[PDB]
């Protein structure tokens, strides 16, 4: 999955998240088209109560069905401040997309972090099942100790997501940030 954001000189904004699902999808090119084929079908619940590749579960609502669109977690998002587009964001991450974007919003509104600060801050995530509070490297040992004392089952795992965001200033100026987790990416303008 990959996400990108755009804001033009007129103030129009677009946030796009699209994907083949896993990296390279099935890895199958469609004949001589040169086009790689997605493995999005794994986003359906294959059987009630059995997790998919992201540990997500389902039942009737997200069951496989002809012509049906499998449930996604993709969240291209825009936050409005004082009636104007203020934050344009999104990210890949399967089940983690929801919490990664959530953190971008919380970091921006509650903690007042600039778009780069919000992007470079560490992330944590809990998706109910499995019952674990997943964390990235970057949290204080003192804090993780307190969380464990609260009953959280902390699990240090791989970095989560690749936010590509743009924040619009009060005067209309643009501020952007690419994720440190992804190399060779870029946020640029004019």
């Amino acid at each position: 999955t990959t996400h990108y954001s755009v804001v033009d000189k007129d103030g129009n904004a677009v946030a796009v998240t699209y994907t083949l699902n896993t990296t390279f999808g099935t890895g199958i090119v469609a004949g001589e088209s040169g086009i790689l084929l997605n493995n999005q079908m794994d986003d359906f619940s294959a059987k009630p109560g059995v997790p998919n590749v992201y540990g997500l579960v389902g039942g009737d609502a997200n069951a496989v069905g002809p012509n049906k669109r499998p449930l996604s977690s993709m969240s291209p998002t825009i936050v409005v401040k004082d009636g104007k587009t203020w934050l344009v964001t999104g990210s890949p991450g399967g089940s983690r997309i929801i919490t990664t974007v959530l953190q971008m919003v919380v970091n921006s509104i509650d903690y007042g972090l600039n778009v780069a600060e919000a992007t470079n801050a560490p992330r944590f995530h809990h998706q109910w099942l499995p019952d674990e509070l997943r964390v990235e490297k970057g949290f204080s040992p003192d804090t993780l100790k307190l969380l464990e004392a609260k009953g959280q089952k902390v699990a240090l795992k791989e970095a989560m997501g690749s936010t590509q965001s743009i924040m619009v200033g009060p005067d209309g100026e643009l501020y952007g940030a690419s994720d440190p987790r992804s190399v060779d990416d870029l946020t640029a303008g004019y």
């Binding site: 099935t26 086009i35 294959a46 291209p76 919003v105 509070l133 992804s182 946020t187």
Partner: protein, 351 residues
């Protein structure tokens, strides 16, 4: 000066993407006079060439558009399961899901919606013709580009698990028995042809033309389900965004078939009941509250979320502030509630 991390700054337009080349393509489109949608489509096509890991023509996705005048809308170009898809299609003979079937076989593919989605958006909200926004990608596919660290790394790690197992894929991404290396040039002649025909004939090339034929044949010869009828029946759908209000800020995101908008709004609604600013980033209290709130949202996700065209999603109840309050009152900042004690919420009193 007090900042450790500094954002990139621009006065007119800006593009943020996972790939330098694609970002520059978008910026050039803006400089040429295209609007955000024009640039977004150009970036999408460019990534389908420079970021084969996820950028694509053979997958699907979502687009959120907000005009300078405030009009906010969502474009759903999520894949559709083939007409021949069945509920238990991924179960083995014993009734247990087979991840191989849903991840690496031809049965794992849904009918692609990216091309349909980009054209729906470009035609209604863009200003440039499809051929102009596809051109950058076409050139990159035809003339090639240098493989960087990101692509080299992904080809070696993730690509090695699937690409070399398919003749056509290996012919493009593998070289001398190994994944393409950093510094190598990746030329995608077949993809260039596909892009050229889309530019000249429009999206119908993908859904009814030569590309459709190629996808259908790939499927028919390998036990896949996507047919020409499936491709001809695919449609991107414009839908109303799911949104909420968090401390006076309005948040807009994707509605079903995505669960994103609903749960982001739901969780924010829960968090609104706590003084998050007081706790602060990286504090055990802030993380405790958010982790707990997330549990309830994902429990609800497992029961109530699905394609709205097939099942009725109780989105109003799930994004209802009174419901969020009922969840907030259950959160003990000093004691986590095991997931075993958390089930999908009872929405009756909120719908």
């Amino acid at each position: 000066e007090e900042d450790v991390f500094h954002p990139v700054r621009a006065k007119q337009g800006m593009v943020a993407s996972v790939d330098a080349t694609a970002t520059q393509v978008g910026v050039d489109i803006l400089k040429e006079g295209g609007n955000a949608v024009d640039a977004a489509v150009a970036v999408g096509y460019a990534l389908a060439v420079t970021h084969p890991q996820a950028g694509n023509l053979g997958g699907g996705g979502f687009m959120l558009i907000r005009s300078k005048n405030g009009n906010t809308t969502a474009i759903d170009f999520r894949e559709m399961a083939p007409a021949k898809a069945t509920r238990d299609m991924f179960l083995d003979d014993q009734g247990n899901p087979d991840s191989k079937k849903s991840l690496t076989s031809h049965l794992a593919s849904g009918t692609p919606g990216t091309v349909a989605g980009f054209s729906l958006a470009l035609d209604k909200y863009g200003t440039m013709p499809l051929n102009k926004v596809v051109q950058p990608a076409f050139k990159l596919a035809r003339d090639g580009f240098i493989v960087n660290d990101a692509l080299a790394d992904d080809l070696k790690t993730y690509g090695s698990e699937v690409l070399p197992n398919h003749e056509n894929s290996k012919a493009i991404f593998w070289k001398e028995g190994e994944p393409l290396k950093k510094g190598d040039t990746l030329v995608q002649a077949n993809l260039a042809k596909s892009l050229e025909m889309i530019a000249e004939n429009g999206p119908d090339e993908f859904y009814k033309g030569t590309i459709a034929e190629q996808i259908a044949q790939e499927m028919q010869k390998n036990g896949g389900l996507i047919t020409k009828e499936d491709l001809a029946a695919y449609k991107a759908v414009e839908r109303t965004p799911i949104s909420g209000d968090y401390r006076g800020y309005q948040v807009y995101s994707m509605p079903p078939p995505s669960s994103g908008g609903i749960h982001i709004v739901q969780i924010l609604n829960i968090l609104e009941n706590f003084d998050m600013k007081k706790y602060g980033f990286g504090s055990a209290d802030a993380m405790q509250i958010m982790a707990e709130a997330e549990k309830y949202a994902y429990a609800d996700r497992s029961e109530y979320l699905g394609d709205p065209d097939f099942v009725k999603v109780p989105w109003q109840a799930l994004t209802n502030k009174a419901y969020a309050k009922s969840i907030a009152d259950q959160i003990d900042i000093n004691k986590a509630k095991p997931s075993s004690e958390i089930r999908p919420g009872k929405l009756a009193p909120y719908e």
